[PDB]
Nucleic acid binder design. Sequence first.
DNA 1: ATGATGACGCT
DNA 2: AGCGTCAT
Length: 430
Amino acid sequence: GPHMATGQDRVVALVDMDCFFVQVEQRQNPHLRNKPCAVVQYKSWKGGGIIAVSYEARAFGVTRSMWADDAKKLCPDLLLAQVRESRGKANLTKYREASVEVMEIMSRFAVIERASIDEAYVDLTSAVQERLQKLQGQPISADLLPSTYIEGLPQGPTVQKEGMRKQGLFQWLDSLQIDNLTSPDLQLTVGAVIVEEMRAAIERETGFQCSAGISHNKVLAKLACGLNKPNRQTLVSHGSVPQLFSQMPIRKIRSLGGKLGASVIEILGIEYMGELTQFTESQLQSHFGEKNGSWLYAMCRGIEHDPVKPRQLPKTIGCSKNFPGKTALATREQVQWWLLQLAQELEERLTKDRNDNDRVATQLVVSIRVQGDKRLSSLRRCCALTRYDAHKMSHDAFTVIKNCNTSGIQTEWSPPLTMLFLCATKFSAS
DNA sequence: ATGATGACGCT
DNA sequence: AGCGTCAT
Ligand SMILES: Nc1ccn([C@H]2C[C@H](O)[C@@H](COP(=O)(O)NP(=O)(O)OP(=O)(O)O)O2)c(=O)n1
Ligand SMILES: [Mg+2]
Ligand SMILES: [Mg+2]
């Protein structure tokens, strides 16, 4: 009882932009606003590959990874914006710059952890402490939570969505203990007030809408965020966890969407996260390892300790291109020309990064894929990154990979290359 | 023939 | 170091 920790020590939010690359293109081009529309890369192969989809287009069944020619069969009026192409490859600069707009606004509120191009975790524990003291001891109005859902409410003894949202919010607020500055539910509620402010600032200052989750840890905040996307935020309290997890497929929890989650399901013969509570910690560690077993034992009870790391900037800067099917690179000079294209984009990004962020990368990682292999990378080699010079980086990358060539000729490359990747890593202050 | 990314764990 | 998992 008195000594069982409940994982309620922190307030953590996750903010995730709604259909992010689409909103970037819709801000730029008002003709795309409030329309079914998608962002595509490489127009020549089947209209291009879809990498982002507006909610109007999702209603027709358009998804990521669809070819645009195929998406047009579901949604004949679908509008498209194409990713910029530079040096024969997709160039994601516009979306990285738009990401920086959002991450700089979030950082005014709390130190962030950049988790992807369009999301960040926030540890609001300290901001909440300070807002609680400024708040005297006065009630939190529903008006301060105009886009907040309380997961699991309403419950107990309306037929539209907004009606239900408010009924649940009313039940929550009506039962809150405001005189107790250490109540975790009160802390989450104040965290949600702050996230409303944060989301209003992002939309005001950028034009972009987003969703968010507010809970006691990263996994629950991430799960919470997706429950009422788009343009809404969701509070998942500790008390909401048993019911929420009772029908929650294991693969929906972050880090369990792959082979480990499949093995949890297969080895234990279960489907839902809540069902994990019936195993001892030792039993879970016996199947999945010490670290995973302890993580699962705590996570299925809503408890997780992974900190919000103070990191706003990516740790690596990389440039990648595939060469699928018949386009696989088969000669030495093809290989050199494309390494050079990659290296030129990398230099551009590295130089900008050194001026903006006062650091330099010191290691260059070169990765390739061979036709016939199975995996994301076939082979990775590093060397020193001592100069931001594209001809030197590309010459160096060739040097460290040039013996992967099984060909007995000089001018040919075998087995042909289906992917090249350059990645700058190991940053030092500058 | 989705692709272009990016963090982090195991060894 | 170099490989693999998981993720957007
Ligand atoms: N596999 C993926 C997933 C996302 N992305 C890019 C495009 C997306 O707009 C952006 C953010 O990914 P996301 O958060 O998973 N989805 P998106 O923001 O488009 O829509 P929501 O479902 O979050 O509203 O990363 C990508 O290029 N490849
Ligand atoms: Mg998003
Ligand atoms: Mg995201």
